[PDB]
Amino acid sequence: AKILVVTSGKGGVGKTTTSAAIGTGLALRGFKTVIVDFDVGLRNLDLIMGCERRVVYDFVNVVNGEATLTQALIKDKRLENLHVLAASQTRDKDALTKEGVEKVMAELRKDFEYIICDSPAGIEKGAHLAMYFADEAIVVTNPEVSSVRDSDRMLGLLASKSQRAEKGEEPIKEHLLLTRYNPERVTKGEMLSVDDVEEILAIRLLGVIPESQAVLKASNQGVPVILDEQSDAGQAYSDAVDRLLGKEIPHRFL
Amino acid sequence: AKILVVTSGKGGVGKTTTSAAIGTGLALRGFKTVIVDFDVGLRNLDLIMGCERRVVYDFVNVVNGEATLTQALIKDKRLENLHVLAASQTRDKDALTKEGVEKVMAELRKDFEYIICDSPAGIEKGAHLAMYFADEAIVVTNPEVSSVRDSDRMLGLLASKSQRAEKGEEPIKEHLLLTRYNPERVTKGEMLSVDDVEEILAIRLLGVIPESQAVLKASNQGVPVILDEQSDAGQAYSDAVDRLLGKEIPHRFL
Amino acid sequence: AKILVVTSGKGGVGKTTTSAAIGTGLALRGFKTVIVDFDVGLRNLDLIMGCERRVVYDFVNVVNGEATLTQALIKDKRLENLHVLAASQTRDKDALTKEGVEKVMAELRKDFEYIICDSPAGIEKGAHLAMYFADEAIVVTNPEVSSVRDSDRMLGLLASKSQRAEKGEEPIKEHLLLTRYNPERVTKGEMLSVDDVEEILAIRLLGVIPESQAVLKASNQGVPVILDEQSDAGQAYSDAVDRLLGKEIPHRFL
Amino acid sequence: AKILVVTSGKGGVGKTTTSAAIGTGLALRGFKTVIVDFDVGLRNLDLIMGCERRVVYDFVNVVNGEATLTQALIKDKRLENLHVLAASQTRDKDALTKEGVEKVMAELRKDFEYIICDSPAGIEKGAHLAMYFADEAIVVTNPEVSSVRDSDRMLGLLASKSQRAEKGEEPIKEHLLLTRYNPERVTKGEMLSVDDVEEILAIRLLGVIPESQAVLKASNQGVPVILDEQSDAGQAYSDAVDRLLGKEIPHRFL
Amino acid sequence: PTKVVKTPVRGGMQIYAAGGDLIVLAAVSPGAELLADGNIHVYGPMRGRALAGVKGDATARIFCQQLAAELVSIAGNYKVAEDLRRSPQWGKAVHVSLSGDVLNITR
Amino acid sequence: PTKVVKTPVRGGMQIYAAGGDLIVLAAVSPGAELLADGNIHVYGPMRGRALAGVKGDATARIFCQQLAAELVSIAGNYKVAEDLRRSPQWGKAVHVSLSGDVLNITR
Amino acid sequence: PTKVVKTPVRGGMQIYAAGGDLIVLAAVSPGAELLADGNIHVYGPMRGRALAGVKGDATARIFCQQLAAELVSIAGNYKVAEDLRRSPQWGKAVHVSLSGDVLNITR
Amino acid sequence: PTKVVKTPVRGGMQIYAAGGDLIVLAAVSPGAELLADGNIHVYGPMRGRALAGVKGDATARIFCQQLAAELVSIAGNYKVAEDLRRSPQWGKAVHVSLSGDVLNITR
Amino acid sequence: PTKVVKTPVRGGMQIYAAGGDLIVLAAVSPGAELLADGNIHVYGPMRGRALAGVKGDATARIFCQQLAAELVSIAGNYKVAEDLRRSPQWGKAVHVSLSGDVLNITR
Ligand SMILES: Nc1ncnc2c1ncn2[C@@H]1O[C@H](COP(=O)(O)OP(=O)(O)OP(=O)(O)O)[C@@H](O)[C@H]1O
Ligand SMILES: Nc1ncnc2c1ncn2[C@@H]1O[C@H](COP(=O)(O)OP(=O)(O)OP(=O)(O)O)[C@@H](O)[C@H]1O
Ligand SMILES: Nc1ncnc2c1ncn2[C@@H]1O[C@H](COP(=O)(O)OP(=O)(O)OP(=O)(O)O)[C@@H](O)[C@H]1O
Ligand SMILES: Nc1ncnc2c1ncn2[C@@H]1O[C@H](COP(=O)(O)OP(=O)(O)OP(=O)(O)O)[C@@H](O)[C@H]1O
Ligand SMILES: [Mg+2]
Ligand SMILES: [Mg+2]
Ligand SMILES: [Mg+2]
Ligand SMILES: [Mg+2]
């Protein structure tokens, strides 16, 4: 019912990590969720969802009609509310039409509660189709001068190039999320603080996720990091999903 | 005369960091160099080249003919062999034709010795035009399972989708470069070693660049990190530039 | 309905590790399972089940009647068929009556399909109450001369000291399981092979579980090792659970 | 004259290995020593002392009076100061009274200098009688989260449940000994370091004994590992006995 | 009539200040439990179970220098470590009090 | 009419032997797909998708020196990497064949 | 048009794949000879004579799982078992190819 | 006739072993210079200038436990700290020797 | 007058620097013995017998990069390998010196 896209503009900020984390966090809460890997030809989401060996059909098959949406969705083993529509490696991002992705968004919206769209990097056509049919958007930002500038270009593209911008509905509800935030390096002054990003971008923070070795360990064993509750980042990911559902929480780990 | 593109596929690995470093390393050697930011609409190179206040005309002005190539090139202040053709923020990556970028590469090849092409992330049209007219290609890789898979997709596109592949000349000479390599995390096993990347990708390493706080400190003050020779990364960047020029050097900092 | 005890005799062979693994393996299959930590006063199961922060009431509260069986059972967060009845640290193993544990086993058998009994070490009263009401018994063995002698003493106590031995029903169905089997040390001759244990103990192997760093890594993060399917031990634990359910599988990792 | 018990709580940490090692190390120094296997019914000490073929009478015979203490003690062949009172396999740990073991401790204290008591695992009655008449206690610990928690329960039982605690003498002098310590795995973070155990338990380390293949080889040929001085563990065992006799030595092999 | 415990309160141990307060000036290992029908002051790293006001007194309090308890409970209203880690002031100097029927966690 | 591929078949690549067999003498990186309507011989470490007998032939075969495929499929009957790891001969020299309607995995 | 031999190719027998490849999925006894003008794939223990590319094709190849042939020859350039035993890869998975005018023995 | 220096050789200091060897068992602070017409052994962290074989001897040697010198020179052929950082064995146990006309840096 | 030995000093061999120092730049096999009445510097893995200051000089020193000697002795006061293995700095860069009447083992 609610299509929210994880986007950034600047590559490598952690979109897939956040997409898998928030996609699992909303399935633990109980909502029947799907995550759509939109990085066609350069797939990455099924690798850190631990779903890479079960993939038979992918995102570009459903568009071209070589399989159905029930044939391509991968039910998880640990969660029953979580499904993943992984992408291909052969065909690149021109093999996704705006019309073909519209059909998949329609019948995904009938069955599921939350649709998480792991956008690829940049401001090009693969990053535009993830943006397009979205209702909300989480913008991922590193606390650094480049990633705030290039995440600012993105918030202006979730206000003009959307579908709710060309059809005149209410605009996309935007959310900011600082990833791989190093609290020790913001006191040395070589990173932006949590309030400089809240001032330059001038929106409400969904949360601040610290630098963690648990993030690389979790993707190395196939699990999202919100299913690792002993660490600091897994806590910080599991509060940002509550802040998605209105429940205001004071930020920690800073 | 020698167009080499810095590419990766996986975003955020350090392409702009490597592009500014290798472009400066070749100007310190004496070669009259230019660096072209190909990330049109999401520019980042002039920010870490320290040239952001001097930009008047950019890459997309030269293409559309709103300025000449001498009106847009920015001579450095610290180096005389180094020039920067920065990109825009207004117009995105569809405003670059294959024919319009063909003309700029033609008259750049008459004046300059080395052309460094800071590729954007992905396998889309902005990453294809940087790939196209290239003679060599440095592929940037983080020592992690995801960044090796997506740097593997890239080497198969620098062998088929090039200009020397559709016209049948000798193919692009490819080089591998591990960036933000953490020697301490490869012994804990959560990153790939220097030989796992040399085995899976199966090419010759241009070098291995350690994790450093000097890289974020240098881009925060406007300087490339190869102009910071006291650090560990500045050393390792200045040896990969010798390895580009045939001089074989034993790898350090591992 | 089927009470099976994980026992050994020789301490430290991996009873708790096997108990949490086989108890989770049967919940992934779909059977509504409970695991009872019988090591009262020296509890370890909730620590590697990841349930240590949710424990309010334990095994010795249900016995003394300080709580009900629904007030003490801990539903898992990742599995819905898996519940844990943890033990205490204050009161030691004399606070368990044969009559008090008889009542808890009675009303556990009404609700659950599989009851896994994490036996403490030795041949004393805490190891006798787990043995007593059992229907099957997995004996855990290290491939070493000492751990086979003391797993041999155990099979003679699951044939005489049981409840189905003093009441004359069919005896306890016993199963052998080699844990932390090192395939490289059995060729140097300093450990027993898979056939020496099958000859001296003279029963059918449920499986052979290799030496793995994944077992200590999983208990350090709160997860059972059968929920880590990338490793070698997680595979070998999930085949012994199929061998518990009749499905014969050829042994691997030897 | 000095009854010291080797205990742990957590089974399999290496109590018998340490008991045989420290029992031989104090006989090499010259003290007339005896080692009492207290694991009645699940005997293990005579197997790794190499004394298993010479056993005629055992620990439970001396208690019941079926033999004398000179008929049951096994003088070693390699040492003249070392004797072993092995245990039975038939009768389990209820066949040891507190009063019957008191008589054997009395006439052992008249003839011998050091009495080493290899405690069985757990916090039950067999582990209580080894604890009871002790003057000092070596607590064995693996550098792991479970073995430190369950060795902490043990230090609180050597302060309240002793004989010098119910009769009000000076309490049992406690000593900590980390066994099968893997120095390589404490840098990966999956084991506790030597200082985390010195902090959580908060006592003085008797020594740190590395992980060694020499330990399994020595028990496979019948010899204690302190009689194997070429290895790393045999060194580390022969320094812990000097640290028992006041001579402070800097810890090695870490 | 204020019992002072100057030794480490190791796991499995239980200390019962029967009349009033209980002051623990050492580290309380996980599994230990400190219960008293007055207040409880723990001036070390507490990792055990603090049970204040056990014989019916909703005015008792728990004071820790480092909040890492497995359970805190005043007069019966408990709060396990699972939902205490979720709040801030975990590992911080904390002051637990019973307001009517809910526990409070101050800094 | 037996197409030989002597280079590394990198991820994202697809090789299509249109007439008959396909011999791959190098490593096939994960994400690559090799499809041929005859047999497929992989004499390197295969980590991609092998699709033999694609145009309706239940007598095609797959031979790998090291079975690490993401998917193997003869004439339509596939077998993903998830249940191939469960059997033995994972990472072993393997020979895949279609017996009627099920895939076989020989050593 | 790729002849598959699933039976043991006993001594004295000769199999002639006349058009292209030849796949032998069984053991080839000493004295047997397998000759084909395409490639030869032997997935058993070969102890006979493999003769690849017999009608003039220097791009044929021989693949054995266990190199124990009495003779290997591509397009006429042979190599008897006497000097094959001297090299390594005897009894090993081997890959024979004709480079210009000499035979190669890869592993 | 082997002069031993057991104190820290602070900056600005100069030590001159006039006859033969020079052994320095302490740290040589940056700016210090140690010159001897025999060998130079530095068993501390050297950060100064080592000048071995100063009176014409191409067989002198420098041994440092930690190579951090500002300059090393045997019989006149020097090597400043700028190009010593570029090679490996910077901060490593090193052994400097003059082969004909160039300096060598062993580990 | 500082004898340099650049070859491996094999077992059974004895090198005698008669005037002063002795530098051995290779591995000294067990059973070899190096004796000199000045200092001894061994920049390889020493496993033999080092005998410093043999003609009465309590100011001699032994320096090894890897302490694995069977015997070290300055001016007569020895220390066999049995009690050297017991100390730390076995296999470590070590510096032996005679303080009055006892040997010292520094790192
Ligand atoms: N909170 C964090 N702390 C530490 N490291 C992180 C965190 N989030 C992500 N990372 C690391 O940063 C890298 C970013 O990769 P990721 O695939 O998440 O980027 P992305 O959002 O997908 O961008 P792209 O699509 O260009 O790859 C990963 O290798 C991950 O391990
Ligand atoms: N060798 C290194 N060590 C430590 N950090 C590094 C290194 N190289 C780059 N980084 C950091 O990683 C981040 C990568 O940003 P950068 O702009 O270089 O990526 P990129 O190659 O441009 O990829 P993209 O074009 O998608 O942004 C930067 O913030 C930089 O500070
Ligand atoms: N298959 C395995 N491979 C490697 N290590 C293992 C394996 N199984 C268990 N271990 C390790 O051995 C130790 C045994 O501890 P565990 O608590 O499992 O023993 P147990 O069966 O509970 O015996 P006890 O009840 O006496 O502690 C653990 O530290 C665990 O990390
Ligand atoms: N320092 C060590 N390094 C490597 N392995 C060890 C070490 N100490 C013990 N072990 C191994 O661990 C196992 C522990 O067995 P041991 O009988 O010593 O345990 P324990 O102290 O007697 O406990 P339990 O009484 O429950 O058996 C033995 O098989 C031994 O080979
Ligand atoms: Mg991504
Ligand atoms: Mg860039
Ligand atoms: Mg247990
Ligand atoms: Mg024992």
mmCIF file with all atom_site columns, N, CA and C in Angstrom, chain B residues 140-164:
data_model
loop_
_atom_site.group_PDB
_atom_site.id
_atom_site.type_symbol
_atom_site.label_atom_id
_atom_site.label_alt_id
_atom_site.label_comp_id
_atom_site.label_asym_id
_atom_site.label_entity_id
_atom_site.label_seq_id
_atom_site.pdbx_PDB_ins_code
_atom_site.Cartn_x
_atom_site.Cartn_y
_atom_site.Cartn_z
_atom_site.occupancy
_atom_site.B_iso_or_equiv
_atom_site.pdbx_formal_charge
_atom_site.auth_seq_id
_atom_site.auth_comp_id
_atom_site.auth_asym_id
_atom_site.auth_atom_id
_atom_site.pdbx_PDB_model_num
ATOM 1  N N  . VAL B 1 140 ? 38.309 0.217  -9.876  1.00 0.00 ? 140 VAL B N  1
ATOM 2  C CA . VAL B 1 140 ? 38.491 0.469  -8.452  1.00 0.00 ? 140 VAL B CA 1
ATOM 3  C C  . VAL B 1 140 ? 37.647 -0.534 -7.673  1.00 0.00 ? 140 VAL B C  1
ATOM 4  N N  . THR B 1 141 ? 38.227 -1.123 -6.630  1.00 0.00 ? 141 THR B N  1
ATOM 5  C CA . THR B 1 141 ? 37.609 -2.269 -5.980  1.00 0.00 ? 141 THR B CA 1
ATOM 6  C C  . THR B 1 141 ? 37.789 -2.157 -4.476  1.00 0.00 ? 141 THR B C  1
ATOM 7  N N  . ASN B 1 142 ? 36.748 -2.348 -3.767  1.00 0.00 ? 142 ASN B N  1
ATOM 8  C CA . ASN B 1 142 ? 36.986 -2.504 -2.346  1.00 0.00 ? 142 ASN B CA 1
ATOM 9  C C  . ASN B 1 142 ? 37.206 -3.976 -2.036  1.00 0.00 ? 142 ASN B C  1
ATOM 10 N N  . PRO B 1 143 ? 38.058 -4.316 -1.085  1.00 0.00 ? 143 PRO B N  1
ATOM 11 C CA . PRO B 1 143 ? 38.223 -5.734 -0.738  1.00 0.00 ? 143 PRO B CA 1
ATOM 12 C C  . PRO B 1 143 ? 37.015 -6.295 -0.002  1.00 0.00 ? 143 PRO B C  1
ATOM 13 N N  . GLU B 1 144 ? 35.913 -6.471 -0.723  1.00 0.00 ? 144 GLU B N  1
ATOM 14 C CA . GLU B 1 144 ? 34.698 -7.031 -0.157  1.00 0.00 ? 144 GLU B CA 1
ATOM 15 C C  . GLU B 1 144 ? 33.976 -7.807 -1.248  1.00 0.00 ? 144 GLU B C  1
ATOM 16 N N  . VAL B 1 145 ? 33.104 -8.730 -0.835  1.00 0.00 ? 145 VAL B N  1
ATOM 17 C CA . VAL B 1 145 ? 32.520 -9.658 -1.801  1.00 0.00 ? 145 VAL B CA 1
ATOM 18 C C  . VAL B 1 145 ? 31.660 -8.910 -2.815  1.00 0.00 ? 145 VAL B C  1
ATOM 19 N N  . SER B 1 146 ? 30.945 -7.869 -2.375  1.00 0.00 ? 146 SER B N  1
ATOM 20 C CA . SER B 1 146 ? 30.063 -7.147 -3.284  1.00 0.00 ? 146 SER B CA 1
ATOM 21 C C  . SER B 1 146 ? 30.868 -6.353 -4.295  1.00 0.00 ? 146 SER B C  1
ATOM 22 N N  . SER B 1 147 ? 31.886 -5.627 -3.829  1.00 0.00 ? 147 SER B N  1
ATOM 23 C CA . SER B 1 147 ? 32.657 -4.765 -4.718  1.00 0.00 ? 147 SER B CA 1
ATOM 24 C C  . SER B 1 147 ? 33.533 -5.545 -5.689  1.00 0.00 ? 147 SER B C  1
ATOM 25 N N  . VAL B 1 148 ? 33.817 -6.815 -5.416  1.00 0.00 ? 148 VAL B N  1
ATOM 26 C CA . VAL B 1 148 ? 34.514 -7.628 -6.404  1.00 0.00 ? 148 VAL B CA 1
ATOM 27 C C  . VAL B 1 148 ? 33.541 -8.158 -7.461  1.00 0.00 ? 148 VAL B C  1
ATOM 28 N N  . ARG B 1 149 ? 32.318 -8.534 -7.064  1.00 0.00 ? 149 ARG B N  1
ATOM 29 C CA . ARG B 1 149 ? 31.331 -8.984 -8.048  1.00 0.00 ? 149 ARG B CA 1
ATOM 30 C C  . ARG B 1 149 ? 31.018 -7.889 -9.055  1.00 0.00 ? 149 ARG B C  1
ATOM 31 N N  . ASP B 1 150 ? 30.888 -6.643 -8.590  1.00 0.00 ? 150 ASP B N  1
ATOM 32 C CA . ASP B 1 150 ? 30.486 -5.555 -9.470  1.00 0.00 ? 150 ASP B CA 1
ATOM 33 C C  . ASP B 1 150 ? 31.653 -4.920 -10.197 1.00 0.00 ? 150 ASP B C  1
ATOM 34 N N  . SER B 1 151 ? 32.875 -5.208 -9.773  1.00 0.00 ? 151 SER B N  1
ATOM 35 C CA . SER B 1 151 ? 34.053 -4.874 -10.550 1.00 0.00 ? 151 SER B CA 1
ATOM 36 C C  . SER B 1 151 ? 34.377 -5.968 -11.550 1.00 0.00 ? 151 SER B C  1
ATOM 37 N N  . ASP B 1 152 ? 33.755 -7.133 -11.395 1.00 0.00 ? 152 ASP B N  1
ATOM 38 C CA . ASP B 1 152 ? 33.855 -8.228 -12.350 1.00 0.00 ? 152 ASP B CA 1
ATOM 39 C C  . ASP B 1 152 ? 32.907 -8.005 -13.517 1.00 0.00 ? 152 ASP B C  1
ATOM 40 N N  . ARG B 1 153 ? 31.699 -7.508 -13.230 1.00 0.00 ? 153 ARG B N  1
ATOM 41 C CA . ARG B 1 153 ? 30.799 -7.080 -14.293 1.00 0.00 ? 153 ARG B CA 1
ATOM 42 C C  . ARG B 1 153 ? 31.425 -5.977 -15.129 1.00 0.00 ? 153 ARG B C  1
ATOM 43 N N  . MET B 1 154 ? 32.279 -5.151 -14.519 1.00 0.00 ? 154 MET B N  1
ATOM 44 C CA . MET B 1 154 ? 32.824 -4.007 -15.236 1.00 0.00 ? 154 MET B CA 1
ATOM 45 C C  . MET B 1 154 ? 33.879 -4.427 -16.251 1.00 0.00 ? 154 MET B C  1
ATOM 46 N N  . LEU B 1 155 ? 34.735 -5.395 -15.908 1.00 0.00 ? 155 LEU B N  1
ATOM 47 C CA . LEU B 1 155 ? 35.775 -5.837 -16.833 1.00 0.00 ? 155 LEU B CA 1
ATOM 48 C C  . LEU B 1 155 ? 35.192 -6.519 -18.056 1.00 0.00 ? 155 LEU B C  1
ATOM 49 N N  . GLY B 1 156 ? 33.985 -7.075 -17.947 1.00 0.00 ? 156 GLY B N  1
ATOM 50 C CA . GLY B 1 156 ? 33.330 -7.617 -19.118 1.00 0.00 ? 156 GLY B CA 1
ATOM 51 C C  . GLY B 1 156 ? 32.670 -6.585 -19.990 1.00 0.00 ? 156 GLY B C  1
ATOM 52 N N  . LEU B 1 157 ? 32.528 -5.356 -19.497 1.00 0.00 ? 157 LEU B N  1
ATOM 53 C CA . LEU B 1 157 ? 32.035 -4.242 -20.291 1.00 0.00 ? 157 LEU B CA 1
ATOM 54 C C  . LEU B 1 157 ? 33.159 -3.402 -20.895 1.00 0.00 ? 157 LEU B C  1
ATOM 55 N N  . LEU B 1 158 ? 34.378 -3.514 -20.375 1.00 0.00 ? 158 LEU B N  1
ATOM 56 C CA . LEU B 1 158 ? 35.556 -2.929 -20.994 1.00 0.00 ? 158 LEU B CA 1
ATOM 57 C C  . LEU B 1 158 ? 36.218 -3.892 -21.964 1.00 0.00 ? 158 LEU B C  1
ATOM 58 N N  . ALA B 1 159 ? 35.470 -4.864 -22.461 1.00 0.00 ? 159 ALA B N  1
ATOM 59 C CA . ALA B 1 159 ? 35.968 -5.787 -23.456 1.00 0.00 ? 159 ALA B CA 1
ATOM 60 C C  . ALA B 1 159 ? 34.996 -5.980 -24.606 1.00 0.00 ? 159 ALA B C  1
ATOM 61 N N  . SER B 1 160 ? 33.778 -5.481 -24.490 1.00 0.00 ? 160 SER B N  1
ATOM 62 C CA . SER B 1 160 ? 32.725 -5.663 -25.476 1.00 0.00 ? 160 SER B CA 1
ATOM 63 C C  . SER B 1 160 ? 32.034 -4.365 -25.856 1.00 0.00 ? 160 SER B C  1
ATOM 64 N N  . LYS B 1 161 ? 31.835 -3.461 -24.905 1.00 0.00 ? 161 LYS B N  1
ATOM 65 C CA . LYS B 1 161 ? 31.050 -2.261 -25.130 1.00 0.00 ? 161 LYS B CA 1
ATOM 66 C C  . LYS B 1 161 ? 31.914 -1.043 -25.425 1.00 0.00 ? 161 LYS B C  1
ATOM 67 N N  . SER B 1 162 ? 33.198 -1.241 -25.704 1.00 0.00 ? 162 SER B N  1
ATOM 68 C CA . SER B 1 162 ? 34.125 -0.128 -25.848 1.00 0.00 ? 162 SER B CA 1
ATOM 69 C C  . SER B 1 162 ? 33.996 0.467  -27.247 1.00 0.00 ? 162 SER B C  1
ATOM 70 N N  . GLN B 1 163 ? 34.924 1.353  -27.614 1.00 0.00 ? 163 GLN B N  1
ATOM 71 C CA . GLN B 1 163 ? 35.079 1.754  -29.007 1.00 0.00 ? 163 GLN B CA 1
ATOM 72 C C  . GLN B 1 163 ? 36.126 0.917  -29.719 1.00 0.00 ? 163 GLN B C  1
ATOM 73 N N  . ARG B 1 164 ? 37.146 0.459  -28.995 1.00 0.00 ? 164 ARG B N  1
ATOM 74 C CA . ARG B 1 164 ? 38.130 -0.457 -29.546 1.00 0.00 ? 164 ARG B CA 1
ATOM 75 C C  . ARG B 1 164 ? 37.634 -1.897 -29.581 1.00 0.00 ? 164 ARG B C  1
#
